[PDB]
């Protein structure tokens, strides 16, 4: 059996729910080094450990703009480390260094170190925080997954990445348009499993409000890679519809992974 599987067998309804089956606790990040602080979210059930995901903010912004993700993901059986950057205008690569510094803090020094399986980690981010996932994955190829939401990075060559990569784009995003950011990054990745999902009519701020389409695939990606949980492949492969009225306007992946 897979010792990392958490929660009952999933359904479309279970990945779309605002809250998964785990009760959630939260507390601020206090005495962090190498990043700006933030908030941690975690299952209160200490009968088992969980993987952890660090989430990095993005468009001249703070963690609060993404904070719906804390309970949304932690309640599916993850430790979520939502961070502030050292400077709100930090470039992408520093944000990736800070993502790794916050994983290191969480697993070694934080009050919930004992709740995390330090061998099963992921990084995620919005906008320039999503652009920082290249540096996080290249510096830490042991990450199980990266998830970029409207990622922004002038560097389009992510060919050295070997970490399973999910990107979300927005069809109405003029800040980090798919054509100039997420799709070039996705197209350069030849050495990792990958998935690209574009949200119809969505602008650069789609990650800042509860979005069931983004959440259900984010959850599924973390389950599949952080937990090795192949019960979630069914939602990723073939993945979303792209018809004229669907909430997804474009979908590409390396199914069956």
Author numbering: 43 to 299
Question: What does the primary publication say about this deposited structure?
Answer:
In the present study, we report a PET hydrolase from Cryptosporangium aurantiacum (CaPETase) that exhibits remarkable PET degradation activity at ambient temperatures and high thermostability. CaPETase shows an α/β hydrolase fold and a nine-stranded β-sheet at the center surrounded by six α-helices and two 310-helices. Formation of one conserved disulfide bond (DS, C279/C297) and lack of an extended loop in the substrate binding site of CaPETase suggest that the enzyme originated from an ancestor of TfCut2 and LCC rather than IsPETase.
To provide a structural basis for high PET hydrolytic activity of CaPETase, we determined its crystal structure at a resolution of 1.36 Å. Interestingly, CaPETase exhibits a somewhat different backbone structure at the active site compared with other PET hydrolases. Interestingly, CaPETase also showed significant differences in the backbone torsion angles at the five connecting loops (β3–α1, β4–α2, β6–β7, β7–α4, and β8–α5) that form an active site, whereas comparisons of the corresponding loops between the other three PET hydrolases exhibited less differences, suggesting that CaPETase has a unique active site conformation. Near the β3–α1 loop, distinct residues positioned in the β4–α2 loop and a W105–L108–G124 network force, which form a unique side-chain internal network, appear to influence the conformation of the β3–α1 loop. A unique A192–G212–F248 network is formed under the β8–α5 loop, where catalytic H246 is located. Therefore, the positioning of a bulky F248 might cause significant torsional differences in the β8–α5 loop and β7–α4 loop of CaPETase. Finally, an R176–W200–F209 network appears to trigger conformational differences in the α3-helix and β6–β7 loop. In addition to the unique backbone conformation at the active site, residues forming the substrate binding cleft of CaPETase showed significant differences compared with other thermophilic PET hydrolases. CaPETase also contains a unique I102 residue in the β3–α1 loop showing the largest torsion differences, whereas other PET hydrolases contain a highly conserved threonine residue at the corresponding position, which probably enables CaPETase to form a relatively wider substrate binding cleft. Taken together, we suggest that along with unique backbone torsion angles, the positioning of distinct residues at the substrate binding site enable CaPETase to form an optimal substrate binding site for high PET hydrolytic activity.
